[PDB]
Design a protein around this nucleic acid. Structure first.
Lengths: 95, 92, 95, 99
DNA sequence: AAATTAACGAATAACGTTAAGCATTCAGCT
DNA sequence: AGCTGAATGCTTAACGTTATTCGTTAATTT
């Protein structure tokens, strides 16, 4: 707690895309998917699919869990920041 | 080879500790059908649930989500995996 | 500058959905379109189509220009406030 | 408060007449005046294309008019365009709501 | 004797592919 | 000695179709 809710397209576009110049359209067919599908993640609108993470790992010689792990961590502190306070009151802890 | 959402719940928490989904429902602040859907194991794991789930079970929310994403991954691995390797061309 | 930009779905969900109770799914089939198409306007992601505005006028017994006029006014002070400063510098006035 | 509609008019029609041919020169100088490339511009005089929202802000500047001017006739175009075009299909498929 | 788990059904909101709309860089005129 | 109409790429819009989440009835289970 106390840091930003970082999205996947942030660790994509400003990390990989900047080191080697990637074009969303060319990247799409490189991934075997339609352009908007790709560009919707670059638009930070998300999200990363599980089949998506699997294909990404192929291109980038990483593990598919890599692209998925930071993705889920986003939502957590997205919703934690959005409605997170509200769920705590309704839920009562168990032994 | 994969691990399901409800397999690590029903076989760990629901059976070896407490009572059934009805009481668990209002304890999690959601309706009953939402809960047993995971016990019925056909999917339905919320991201929002994990935040709620960590609370009852004194665990981290990250715990329940880590196996969740790993689920989709391993299921689809044999499922769409063959199609994925061929269609996707490697990058530098 | 001088006012905040206002989206169509704002003058929709508030003035209309709240005054007479609307439901995005039912409004969808009432408008002859798929639900997300409708709810994407309520989500204020945008945006109002020209064929759409014509459809709305039928349901709401208003003119189609009503829904379109506020649409164009939005983009105007969206872009005016976003990149608008950059536009003024690059454009040179004519007689 | 009734349809259906009649003949539309595009922005590039209201461009070449009243603005482009009268008192003025064409797309080469006009491009650089608007900060955009030539093809973007003549596409409207040729009427193949739409009127941008970003352009309307730029046109108001050159022609000492409001940006709303150019955008108002733009939507009226699409509305009137689609009015006879998809109009038959739209009236039938859409059923009026409580009002 | 009596809740309750499993099943229908609608809501919204994802993801996705498809199709259209937009500004640079080579070719054909004026 | 030019500059407008084509041809191609990018992105972003709009849309439809297809999946996950709560009410409510029905069947179950001491």
């Amino acid at each position: 707690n106390g840091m930003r809710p970082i999205h996947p397209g942030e660790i994509l576009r400003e990390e990989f895309q900047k080191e080697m110049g990637f074009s969303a359209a060319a990247l799409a067919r490189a991934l075997g998917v339609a352009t908007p599908t790709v560009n919707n993640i670059l638009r930070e609108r998300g999200g990363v699919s599980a089949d998506m993470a699997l294909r990404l790992s192929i291109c980038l010689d990483t593990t598919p869990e890599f692209w998925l792990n930071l993705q889920t961590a986003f939502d957590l502190r997205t919703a934690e920041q959005q409605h997170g306070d509200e769920i705590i009151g309704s839920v009562q802890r168990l032994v």
